[PDB]
Design a protein around this ligand. Structure first.
Ligand SMILES: Nc1ncnc2c1ncn2[C@@H]1O[C@H](COP(=O)(O)OP(=O)(O)O)[C@@H](O)[C@H]1O
Ligand SMILES: Nc1ncnc2c1ncn2[C@@H]1O[C@H](COP(=O)(O)OP(=O)(O)O)[C@@H](O)[C@H]1O
Ligand SMILES: Nc1ncnc2c1ncn2[C@@H]1O[C@H](COP(=O)(O)OP(=O)(O)O)[C@@H](O)[C@H]1O
Ligand SMILES: [Ca+2]
Ligand SMILES: [Ca+2]
Ligand SMILES: [Ca+2]
Ligand SMILES: [Ca+2]
Ligand SMILES: [Ca+2]
Ligand SMILES: [Ca+2]
Ligand SMILES: [Ca+2]
Ligand SMILES: [Ca+2]
Ligand SMILES: [Mg+2]
Ligand SMILES: [Mg+2]
Ligand SMILES: [Mg+2]
Ligand SMILES: [Mg+2]
Ligand SMILES: [Mg+2]
Ligand code: NA
Ligand code: NA
Ligand code: NA
Ligand code: NA
Ligand code: NA
Ligand code: NA
Ligand code: NA
Ligand code: NA
Ligand code: NA
Ligand code: NA
Ligand code: NA
Ligand code: NA
Ligand code: NA
Ligand code: NA
Ligand code: NA
Ligand code: NA
Lengths: 510, 510, 255
């Protein structure tokens, strides 16, 4: 179909003969400069290549406002997710309309020149409530208040180059490129599948049913920009994707990475995804159970209904101009050894089985087996590889402040004890001396699979610097992970408590 | 047999009723204090428990001198290795005979009180030449000039407690304890086997032949103090030992760890080992090929003859008072599938096979297979565990100073590139800013299996702080590990050069 | 078809006989390969019959036998071509051959050694191993020599308790024969059953014939003892180690 708005806004192509000129300007000693944030680098790349057609810059207050209260741009164009350039009060104060800002990446690569139209201070509460449904735990809302700048700068863009990427160099197809790919193959019907997790049997089966139902070729269009905090990294996922694609019949599917920054905005996001995919050249778009949803909040309540996205997309049907292929929960059928949409089976006279993400996360962490029927073995291998079971995980033991025994001696005792177990983990007594340059390394080591023995706590003001994962506190405090009987407890006693704690949590296996 | 000199000098036992008193003195605000070095902690523990009988303190100039030129103590007692308390000029200058020094461990645990007899400044060249054969590459000589203090403090000792150890708590038997062990079992003939490497098939067979020839039980008495730089760590070895001991027939062998600090002093060391083992209660002592030798120097010449130790031990035969069980190179016989002393086979009409240490080190580093006939599979598994093949090893890439491209961008490019390979390694751009507190972590990460991308070199004055292993230099310099064509070489070009280099070196396997 | 014939191992004469027998049984052709019906070599290593004496004798009686003889030259293995063939059809010069002799096979079976996939079929080898078990599965007997001066009762118990701790499936017993042949004749039944027997003392020479010498070892100071003691009064623990290591050296024990 035609790109949203009718015109593919590939500004890289549009501004080709301006490149050298824009470049010089971007590099002048007088232009105002803003180094894009991660999500901003994600958004700007989708703007500059026509992925966000009709957009051609970041939303001004007029367009922004309409998107928030209307799910439409000011001119009425269907558009549900606001794409804005969020800056701080400091930077904002130097901006005036007509001003031109050079937007850099990594403070080194000139990306584009923004021509300021306005500078407004959005009401984050409204955006939170109206666009993301107001639950404070919602990924988009937390980002909105905890990461996003408080001032939005609207304005038109002029492309210099798309953000730089040194990984998966040829796989990040642009709308024009993809469109050219489908064309060289004479693909006039393509059903796109969005995804931010690894693909298992259910997915392969669901995408193939789609391909069969729609009579169209398959485009595995995974998101490699920004997803949900805690998701599997995209590298591991690309591997999973490249492997699973080999399970489809020869010549039926194409893999292209989308550098989109998700919002986990359930239904609104689905509408947005469809618009994006249309721009990229797709004729059909899959929308399954809880599309783009962030699951449930800590209270166990749903951020979105399992089919809210499908319903919203359906209501915008005659406007989207891209065919939606909706799916009901695709589950496993033991007795027939096959998958199928839940709406096609009698959940009464047929048994179903389902390993949820939580359940999978758990198996991977315990080294548990994952059913041959659940996912393909190569996929699971890749997953285990970057999401190792406890006996391969790193950790850190912190000698609480309440501790009254010799910290030096207790440290050594823990070190020498861990050492005898053997098994391949690296251990170290890590003294941070409250130096954040050190505190920031604690997780790098845990991430490397190492066991760190930390002689003492760090200032509360520095706590943010440290990644709490696999970081256990040894103290008499009720809120200690490994609680001591008393601050003066004999070392050997403490050592056993710690060993048994770590062994009870899978770090040690004898 | 009786301990050397006739009296077991278990000073812990001797000074039992002085402990509280010595303790108080050691902790007085007026006594001179010296924190023992690693080798000194190894030596003092062998002195305090009677392992170095007849010694009861560190050698004074008279005794030291005799050992160096006579291989005997001043009184004529056969003794080949000098055991001295080496301190620096600063400390030495505060010492006077009759002075009492409190010797601590980790600046916290009071070990003993030394009563100074003298303070002399040895001629390290004579000791080097006369005791260790003068080759500068010799482990004991290098230590002598590079680590040992320049002033020796002779004097008698008074025990407070043996150095503290939190690992393998019950396995470090003292001479008295071991003697009691052998006794409770009614072992009146025990052949001891010294070792600082892992034990393979040859070892098991040779120690069993010894047990059969000598009609004695087997004592696997491994060194866990200090050995040769580069040796397998003692923890990995203790595991190897505890595993291999299960291959001997039920009730024939005993394992006890010896906290001795080796000198790699070939023949002199063998004589010493025999004296030590006798003190510990052994009736027989094995002395095989190149006993306690450090191999060859970089020039490929032998530090000691393959049987120099056997010959020296043989010349001191009637003095040692402990039976020596000599062995000729024990090798493998393919066709008969068995091991045997080289002196018992016709190297003419029978074929032999031998995987040397170098060869083994190599296989372990490439992930190569180790013959079922060479070592036991569990042993090899443990070895692989702590001596992982390249695809599991950590490394560091250093952006040379000559580099002219963007260091930030090249770093990110290398990061993103390594990331796509997947496979379990952790990567990080590590900025040290010449801070030694950071430089000193480079090897901790390499040791943890991580790949570090270092944006720039460090001051030459700080070079010592970093462990050179798996640390590669990317530069135009002729002496660069990964040599660049030119300082301005395009990033993608550099990235490929680095990738292929790492892949050529086993770090990456596709 | 099974032939209840009692062989004579009479090489060439026997081959002629076999042909006559097979003809009676209805055969039209009879194979006569290398060293047909020969008993190998005597202890001195000399051949009882030439490798082809049988073929030659059969050939001389050719027109009388009235049954066709199909002679074969040593059929051997060819590694590089992975196939068998008569030695007379290959150039033992430009082609390499391999051969696992009976002795060699007997040996592998006794040590639990592997037998090449190319030598025999795996099911065959399994069946062979089953009834010709490797040493760690074999039975044996230790005999406390007459020269022994230590307590026979105590040494017996010591050996019993020691073997017991090794575990692994073998059955052990102190077997007193009291020179009764009805008992001596059971020694091999037990060895044959895989058991380890500890025999407190020797048996009269007149009864020696009654016992099957296989896997029966003599512990004594005598020069002709299988496990030689240093002295008749050697302490028990010392003797026990000597015996254990002897048995382990002979594959009976594997740790
Ligand atoms: N079991 C399932 N049944 C139907 N649809 C599914 C199922 N699992 C995943 N999907 C759909 O696959 C697509 C991508 O899956 P996933 O990455 O987990 O979520 P997201 O929608 O956040 O990208 C979504 O449209 C989702 O609704
Ligand atoms: N293949 C061998 N043949 C003969 N003796 C050997 C062999 N391997 C090891 N040994 C002997 O085993 C003992 C311990 O071996 P090792 O740990 O390698 O050396 P070290 O003497 O430095 O502890 C030494 O007496 C050594 O000479
Ligand atoms: N490798 C061989 N090459 C040629 N002939 C063989 C070979 N092996 C066995 N034969 C022949 O197979 C027949 C039966 O073999 P075998 O049972 O070992 O001997 P026997 O003649 O005593 O029954 C004999 O004719 C023998 O010569
Ligand atoms: Ca704010
Ligand atoms: Ca729900
Ligand atoms: Ca207390
Ligand atoms: Ca010096
Ligand atoms: Ca040599
Ligand atoms: Ca140039
Ligand atoms: Ca012959
Ligand atoms: Ca006697
Ligand atoms: Mg990009
Ligand atoms: Mg989902
Ligand atoms: Mg100690
Ligand atoms: Mg050696
Ligand atoms: Mg035959
Ligand atoms: Na249309
Ligand atoms: Na910079
Ligand atoms: Na509100
Ligand atoms: Na349709
Ligand atoms: Na709903
Ligand atoms: Na538990
Ligand atoms: Na003596
Ligand atoms: Na201290
Ligand atoms: Na020599
Ligand atoms: Na003597
Ligand atoms: Na002797
Ligand atoms: Na090479
Ligand atoms: Na003949
Ligand atoms: Na006839
Ligand atoms: Na014929
Ligand atoms: Na032997």
């Amino acid at each position: 179909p035609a790109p949203h708005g009718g015109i593919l806004q590939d500004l890289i192509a549009r501004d080709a003969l301006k490149k050298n000129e824009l470049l010089s300007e971007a590099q002048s000693s007088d232009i105002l400069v803003w180094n894009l944030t991660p999500r901003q680098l994600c958004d700007i790349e989708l703007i500059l290549n026509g992925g966000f057609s009709p957009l051609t810059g970041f939303l001004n207050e007029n367009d922004y406002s309409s998107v928030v209260t209307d799910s439409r741009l000011a001119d009425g164009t269907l558009w549900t997710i606001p794409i804005t350039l969020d800056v701080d009060e400091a930077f904002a104060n130097q901006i005036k309309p007509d001003t031109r800002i050079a937007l850099f990446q990594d403070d080194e690569i000139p990306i584009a020149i923004l021509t300021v139209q306005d500078v407004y201070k959005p009401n984050k509460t409204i955006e939170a409530e109206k666009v993301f449904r107001g639950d404070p735990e919602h990924p988009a809302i937390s980002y909105l208040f905890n990461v996003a700048g408080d001032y939005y700068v609207g304005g038109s863009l002029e492309a210099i180059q798309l953000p730089q990427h040194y990984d998966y160099p040829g796989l990040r197809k642009t709308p024009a490129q993809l469109r050219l790919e489908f064309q060289s193959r004479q693909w006039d019907r393509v059903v796109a599948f969005q995804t931010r997790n690894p693909m298992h049997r259910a997915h392969r089966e669901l995408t193939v049913r789609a391909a069969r139902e729609a009579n169209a070729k398959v485009l595995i269009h995974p998101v490699v920009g920004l997803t949900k905090p805690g998701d599997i990294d995209h590298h591991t996922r690309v591997r999973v994707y490249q492997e699973i694609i080999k399970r489809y019949p020869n010549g039926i599917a194409f893999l292209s990475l989308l550098p989109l920054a998700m919002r986990m905005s359930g239904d609104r996001e689905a509408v947005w995804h469809a618009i994006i995919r249309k721009n990229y050249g797709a004729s059909h778009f899959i929308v399954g159970r809880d599309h783009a949803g962030p699951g449930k909040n800590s209270k166990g309540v749903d951020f979105y209904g399992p089919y809210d996205a499908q319903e919203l997309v359906e209501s915008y049907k005659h406007e989207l101009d891209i065919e939606v292929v909706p799916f009901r929960m695709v589950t496993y059928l033991p007795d027939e050894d096959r998958y199928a949409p839940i709406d096609q089976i009698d959940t009464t006279k047929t048994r179903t089985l389902n390993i949820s993400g939580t359940e999978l996360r758990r198996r991977l962490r315990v080294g548990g087996e994952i059913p041959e029927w659940f996912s393909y073995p190569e996929v699971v291998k890749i997953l285990r590889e970057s999401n190792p079971p406890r006996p391969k995980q790193g950790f850190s033991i912190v000698l609480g402040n309440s501790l009254t025994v010799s910290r030096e001696q207790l440290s050594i005792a823990l070190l020498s004890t861990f050492l005898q177990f053997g098994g391949g983990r690296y251990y170290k007594i890590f003294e941070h001396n409250n130096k954040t340059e050190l505190l920031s390394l604690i997780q790098d080591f845990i991430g490397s699979g190492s066991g760190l023995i930390i002689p003492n706590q760090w200032e509360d003001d520095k706590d943010s610097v440290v990644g709490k994962q696999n970081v256990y506190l040894l103290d008499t405090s009720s809120s200690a992970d490994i609680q001591l009987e008393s601050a003066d407890e004999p070392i050997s006693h403490i050592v056993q408590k710690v060993v048994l704690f770590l062994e009870d949590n899978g770090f040690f296996v004898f």
